[PDB]
Amino acid sequence: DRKAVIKNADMSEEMQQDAVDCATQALEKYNIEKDIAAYIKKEFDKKYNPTWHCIVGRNFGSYVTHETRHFIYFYLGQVAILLFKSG
Amino acid sequence: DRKAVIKNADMSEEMQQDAVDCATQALEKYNIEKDIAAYIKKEFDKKYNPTWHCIVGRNFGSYVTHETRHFIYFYLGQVAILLFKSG
């Protein structure tokens, strides 16, 4: 099982833990990046209200405008996950 | 120079061309993914109003909620670019 490394976050500690949990569940269920991303996005829309956006990959870079306290960029093993609400 | 392949788009033809042009300029200037993404995002905020978000990589997958007519996912060579406004 996979090592969580949080790279950048503007998010409550409890929500960061839910993000890691959600992504862990997603990787258990799915192997294709877009399917992993959709699972996480949908779960966060449910738990923490719409509207979330999720990117899953390895090496991608990003520049997004996020809502205060609704942003995380982290790795689970070698898989990078960006999850945020837009500002 | 790089071959443009548009994978998915919900965007005017003129705006798609500007996206390809912007990304071409970005790749001429910068080598690091997050810097490429920031250039494109900033140019689209200027030309087509805030608020855009941009991901640059190779193999990433995504699931985002986009504003009608403000979404493109395309490749320039092997570089994948996602550019959208949130719905």
From Swiss-Prot, chains A, B:
Biological processes, Gene Ontology terms: actin filament bundle assembly; chaeta development; chaeta morphogenesis; establishment of mitotic spindle orientation; imaginal disc-derived wing morphogenesis; microtubule anchoring at centrosome; oogenesis; positive regulation of neuron remodeling
Places the protein is found: Cytoplasm, Cytoskeleton
Record's keyword terms, sorted: Cytoplasm, Cytoskeleton, Dynein, Microtubule, Motor protein, Transport
Keyword Cytoplasm included in the entry's annotation: yes
Tissue: Ubiquitous.
GO CC annotation: centriole; cytoplasm; cytoplasmic dynein complex; cytosol; dynein complex; microtubule; nucleus; protein-containing complex
Mutant lacking the gene: phenotype: Flies exhibit defects in bristle and wing development.
Residue ranges crossing the lipid bilayer per the database entry: none
GO molecular function annotations of the record: disordered domain specific binding; dynein intermediate chain binding; dynein light intermediate chain binding; protein homodimerization activity; transcription corepressor activity
InterPro entries: DLC_sf (IPR037177), Dynein_light_1/2_CS (IPR019763), Dynein_light_chain_typ-1/2 (IPR001372)
SUPFAM superfamilies registered for this protein in UniProt: DLC
Primary localization class, coarse: cytoplasm
Pfam families with a match to the protein in the record: Dynein_light (PF01221)
PROSITE patterns found in the cross-reference section: DYNEIN_LIGHT_1
Domain of life: Eukaryota
Gene3D superfamilies: Protein Inhibitor Of Neuronal Nitric Oxide Synthase
Family stated for the protein in its record: Belongs to the dynein light chain family.
Described purpose of this protein according to its UniProt entry: Acts as a non-catalytic accessory component of a dynein complex.
Quaternary organization: Interacts with spn-F. Forms ternary complexes with spn-F and IKKepsilon.
Designated name of the protein: Dynein light chain 1, cytoplasmic
Lineage: Eukaryota, Metazoa, Ecdysozoa, Arthropoda, Hexapoda
Gene behind this protein: ctp
